[PDB]
Ligand binder design. Structure first.
Ligand SMILES: NC(=O)c1cc([N+](=O)[O-])c(Cl)cc1NCc1cncnc1
Length: 294
């Protein structure tokens, strides 16, 4: 209500329902997300408002935050498609390496900007990466997780995807660092390359064990302090690490090298977005035009 004309429902968003809407005034087309629950903290409104100032070409612009009678409305710049749908559509042929590289490079620029401004995403996944016809890709939902501590679910009994969760979160760490986003982005990079989710767990423990089966069960050597983590159990099975050549074939050594650094167990050893941008993998990065059908 008030200035907005609903064009259609986009989906059952993470924090609520989402509509494509037109601002009767400006005439602009936007994504409007209606947030839960029956209170809505004033701390969240302030923190969220802060995000309106977080502007970068690879970050979906938060145009407005509107608090009104039990419901928070977030108005975002609109993009027609997300990476999850694009990957499904490119399943038979695969996304061309040059485009995978362009997307990864752009997402790292976005993360570097967010992280330098002390903003974490915390829930990166293909569905939260939006793309347009110009070859741009943008991070969506940056900072919402913190302005709400822990998201948990959507609003209509939906199965929370754990596929992109960093191991420190799964092991009960209470303090997230910028490293959790690099881990999620690494999982997404692998998925674009192989056309299959890297760690498709269907429970928190299945997610953790899928990670362990591929990267090896972590220990104090590769991850100092891991055995003192909240949910770590000495009873975890001990699996040997597999070779990356087997995990993301036929990605080249530059790609495997970068991916391995994005998937280090120790959050402190995990590569930063800034450092990743300098990796030899991006020596020949370009900005291709995607084949997008809308
Ligand atoms: N910012 C946005 O444009 C956007 C926001 C949200 N959201 O949650 O606030 C969602 Cl779901 C999807 C979006 N767009 C991608 C899309 C658009 N139309 C049809 N399928 C996908």
């Amino acid at each position: 209500m008030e200035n907005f004309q609903k064009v259609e429902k986009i989906g059952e968003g993470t924090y609520g329902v989402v509509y494509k809407a037109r601002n009767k005034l400006t005439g602009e087309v936007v994504a409007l997300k209606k947030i839960r629950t029956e209170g809505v903290p004033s701390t969240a409104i302030r923190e969220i408002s802060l995000l309106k100032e977080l502007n970068h070409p690879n970050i979906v612009k938060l145009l407005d935050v509107i608090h009104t009678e039990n419901k928070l409305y977030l108005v975002f710049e609109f993009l027609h498609q997300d990476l999850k749908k694009f990957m499904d559509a490119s399943a038979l042929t695969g996304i061309p390496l040059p485009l995978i590289k362009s997307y990864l490079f752009q997402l790292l620029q976005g993360l570097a900007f967010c992280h330098s401004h002390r903003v974490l995403h915390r829930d990166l996944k293909p569905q939260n990466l939006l793309i347009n016809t110009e070859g741009a890709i943008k991070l969506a939902d940056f900072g919402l997780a913190r302005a709400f501590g822990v998201p948990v679910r959507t609003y209509t009994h939906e199965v929370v995807t754990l596929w992109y969760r960093a191991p420190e979160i799964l092991l009960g760490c209470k303090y997230y660092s910028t490293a959790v986003d690099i881990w999620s982005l690494g999982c997404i990079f692998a998925e674009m390359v192989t056309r299959r989710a890297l760690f498709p767990g269907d429970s928190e423990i299945d997610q953790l064990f899928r990670i362990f089966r591929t990267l090896g069960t972590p220990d104090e050597v590769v991850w100092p302090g891991v055995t003192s983590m909240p949910d770590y159990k000495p009873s975890f099975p001990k699996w040997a690490r597999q070779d990356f050549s087997k995990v993301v074939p036929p990605l080249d050594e530059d790609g495997r090298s970068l991916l391995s650094q994005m998937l280090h167990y120790d959050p402190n050893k995990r590569i930063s977005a800034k450092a990743a941008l300098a990796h030899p993998f991006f020596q020949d990065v370009t900005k291709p035009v995607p084949h997008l059908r809308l």
